[PDB]
Amino acid sequence: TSILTNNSAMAALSGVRSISSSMEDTQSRISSGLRVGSASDNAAYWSIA
Amino acid sequence: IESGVGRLVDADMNEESTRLKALQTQQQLAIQALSIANSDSQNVLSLFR
């Protein structure tokens, strides 16, 4: 056991970051509709729209 | 001439009613999403007991 590093905490941190990014994306998606909401989404469908 | 003025200026009420209902629903969803976003912030307190 090392008090200087925590592999489990780091993995949990990466998981939390991924969940936060996904939650932000879904929250914007439900706020404004627009499944293709910006150019960061599928560019071809955005241009067609 | 006034019939032409009406054709150029009058608006169908049914489409406006549909838009009003859609915008009311969108406002309700946006308010709910904003409330969820505000409630998201205070979850971090669990780390600091």
Curated annotation (Swiss-Prot), chain B:
Flagellin is the subunit protein which polymerizes to form the filaments of bacterial flagella. Homomer of FlaA is able to form a functional filament. Belongs to the bacterial flagellin family. It comes from Rhizobium meliloti (Ensifer meliloti). The chain holds residues 347 to 395 of 395 of the full protein. This is Flagellin A. It is found in: Secreted; Bacterial flagellum.
